[PDB]
Symmetry: C2
Subunit: 222 residues, 2 copies
Amino acid sequence: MGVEERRQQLIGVALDLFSRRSPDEVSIDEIASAAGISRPLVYHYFPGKLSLYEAALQRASDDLADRFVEPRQGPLGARLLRVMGRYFDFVDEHGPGFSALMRGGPAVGSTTTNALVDSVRQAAYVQILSHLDVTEPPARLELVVRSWISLAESTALLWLDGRRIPRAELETQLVHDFAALMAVSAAYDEEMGALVRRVLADEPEDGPFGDLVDRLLALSAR
Amino acid sequence: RRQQLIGVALDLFSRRSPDEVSIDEIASAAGISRPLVYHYFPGKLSLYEAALQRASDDLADRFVEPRQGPLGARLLRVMGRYFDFVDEHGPGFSALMRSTTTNALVDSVRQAAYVQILSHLDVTEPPARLELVVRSWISLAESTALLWLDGRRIPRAELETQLVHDFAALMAVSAAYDEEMGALVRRVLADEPEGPFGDLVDRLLALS
């Protein structure tokens, strides 16, 4: 194969291995072997293991960020649920590498890896505001949204540790969590209250939010 | 002297990001020479880690709360101490959250919070759904405090109560679709009036 083909092949092979195992268990020799090339030939394309890991992570990060893009049509909850399906598909596909990267955190990460992870978090933020139709988010809204993004990261990481709860339940849970976090904040702020009322007015009366409220009323045995 | 030096280092590492804290600065503040700091610590990272261990023990100890009265009030009292701590250590906390020893120390605080929450819920064998709710809330609380520190545009009193209501919310969402979680919530609502759960249910009713 040609040079650019080979570079992109190598990034793919690296991404495959770094997805399957923690990065301490992936070697240049294994990457070379999977790619069908010699050890020195890998170093022709990348000067070390970290640069290849970063290149794989760039590809993965671009993939997840693109998965956040969803048409601004129909009830908002359903849009978010669709993105949550793609998000869990991604987490599944990349699980062992995702867990290793995230449970390492910014301390272990290179400046480049931390920047890539942050760029994904920011891509999520931008999409959520687009759907909310907000360009100048107030403080309270920014905190709810960013703290939900942290909640969604945590939920996926906890899911991967044993998969003791079905992903479909967690996807729906994260959608309900978003409504609930926003509703909690609405108590302290009229501007927040108005946004949440508008968002919930866009849900059908027979929708999942409806069913959540019905279930909570039932639990309360009012 | 070694314990005094750790305190001085924690003070400076609390006030500024660690790239802005030098051994010479620690030595001056402690009133000792640069060599005497190296006598106790091989290098800057080891002293950073010692300061973090002290801070981590302080926060974990702040999670201890008597098992008495309504649960929401217990958690609100802990949130007051948590935000006090975050305030006192703001710049250093921000910089840390943005070694494997320091990761281990941070993890040990998250675990301490977990243990205390389950203690109060009177649960020794937490179901998967409860574990995920509690751990995910701990992440939410970490995130909320870090976001608060960036500008302090929202008052801490609001975020403290917001976090208590968020715990009830995360639990409620799970309980709505899981019988075992539903039973736990009902067992746990038997001592709150109409408490964060009741107000949340009223709110979801009223905002819809």
